[PDB]
Design a protein around this motif. Structure first.
Motif, PDB file in Angstrom:
ATOM      1  N   UNK A  25     -24.782  24.934  18.065  1.00  0.00           N
ATOM      2  CA  UNK A  25     -24.697  23.749  17.123  1.00  0.00           C
ATOM      3  C   UNK A  25     -24.450  22.590  18.516  1.00  0.00           C
ATOM      4  N   UNK A  26     -23.559  22.999  19.486  1.00  0.00           N
ATOM      5  CA  UNK A  26     -23.544  22.237  20.682  1.00  0.00           C
ATOM      6  C   UNK A  26     -25.436  21.989  21.466  1.00  0.00           C
ATOM      7  N   UNK A  27     -25.696  23.062  21.910  1.00  0.00           N
ATOM      8  CA  UNK A  27     -26.804  22.505  21.960  1.00  0.00           C
ATOM      9  C   UNK A  27     -28.198  22.026  21.491  1.00  0.00           C
ATOM     10  N   UNK A  28     -27.546  22.230  19.965  1.00  0.00           N
ATOM     11  CA  UNK A  28     -28.571  21.188  18.562  1.00  0.00           C
ATOM     12  C   UNK A  28     -27.975  19.204  19.311  1.00  0.00           C
ATOM     13  N   UNK A  29     -26.136  19.538  19.657  1.00  0.00           N
ATOM     14  CA  UNK A  29     -25.551  18.125  20.019  1.00  0.00           C
ATOM     15  C   UNK A  29     -26.182  17.332  21.111  1.00  0.00           C
ATOM     16  N   UNK A  32     -29.660  16.438  20.953  1.00  0.00           N
ATOM     17  CA  UNK A  32     -30.065  15.356  19.990  1.00  0.00           C
ATOM     18  C   UNK A  32     -29.503  13.781  21.031  1.00  0.00           C
ATOM     19  N   UNK A  33     -28.261  14.131  21.267  1.00  0.00           N
ATOM     20  CA  UNK A  33     -28.094  12.802  22.207  1.00  0.00           C
ATOM     21  C   UNK A  33     -29.266  13.058  23.423  1.00  0.00           C
ATOM     22  N   UNK A  38     -33.333   9.198  25.110  1.00  0.00           N
ATOM     23  CA  UNK A  38     -34.516   8.575  25.676  1.00  0.00           C
ATOM     24  C   UNK A  38     -35.463   7.883  24.731  1.00  0.00           C
ATOM     25  N   UNK A  39     -34.871   7.765  23.085  1.00  0.00           N
ATOM     26  CA  UNK A  39     -35.633   6.811  22.078  1.00  0.00           C
ATOM     27  C   UNK A  39     -35.301   5.334  22.868  1.00  0.00           C
ATOM     28  N   UNK A  40     -33.541   5.315  22.881  1.00  0.00           N
ATOM     29  CA  UNK A  40     -33.043   3.546  23.296  1.00  0.00           C
ATOM     30  C   UNK A  40     -33.819   3.466  24.271  1.00  0.00           C
TER      31      UNK A  40
ATOM     32  N   UNK B  57     -35.131  10.504  33.000  1.00  0.00           N
ATOM     33  CA  UNK B  57     -35.363  11.371  33.013  1.00  0.00           C
ATOM     34  C   UNK B  57     -35.017  12.749  33.605  1.00  0.00           C
ATOM     35  N   UNK B  58     -33.517  12.215  33.832  1.00  0.00           N
ATOM     36  CA  UNK B  58     -33.094  13.729  34.615  1.00  0.00           C
ATOM     37  C   UNK B  58     -32.601  14.550  34.073  1.00  0.00           C
ATOM     38  N   UNK B  59     -32.955  14.333  32.494  1.00  0.00           N
ATOM     39  CA  UNK B  59     -32.890  15.456  31.239  1.00  0.00           C
ATOM     40  C   UNK B  59     -31.428  16.218  32.019  1.00  0.00           C
TER      41      UNK B  59
END
Lengths: 65, 59
Positions: A25-29, A32-33, A38-40, B57-59
């Motif tokens: 769940x932490x990796x999911x969050x 997703x953030x 990136x989309x923004x 893009x540092x990710x």
């Protein structure tokens, strides 16, 4: 024997049958953030590019000789 | 008044086309300057956005 028993216990409790699934769940969050940021960023970039493109079209199409 | 101005324009063009040529040259120069300025502004914005993406893009 104590070292081997501790190693086997750590082995079975590390990833074999750990009821702690909240890491997924932490990796999911986190991902997703990341993809939301990136989309923004892409949306802001395309908006600025569209504004500049319209401002450039207004000068290109209306100028010929 | 507009028709009077246009009649003056006709008499001037038939009496002195050099003024029309100079005006056309000035308009072309102004258009070139405006196009160069717009291109420079677009390039500045594009470079700013490129740096923004490279930093984000540092990710």
């Amino acid at each position: 024997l104590m070292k081997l028993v501790s190693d086997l216990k750590q082995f079975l409790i590390l990833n074999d049958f750990p009821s702690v699934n909240e890491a997924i769940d932490q990796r999911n969050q986190q991902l997703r953030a990341l993809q939301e940021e990136c989309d923004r960023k892409l949306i802001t970039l395309r908006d600025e590019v569209s504004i500049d493109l319209y401002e450039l079209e207004e000068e290109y199409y209306s100028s010929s000789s | 008044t507009e028709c009077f101005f246009l009649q003056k324009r006709l008499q001037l063009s038939v009496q002195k086309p050099d003024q029309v040529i100079k005006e056309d040259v000035s308009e072309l120069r102004s258009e070139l300057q405006r196009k160069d300025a717009l291109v420079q502004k677009h390039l500045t914005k594009l470079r700013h956005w490129q740096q923004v993406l490279e930093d984000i893009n540092v990710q």
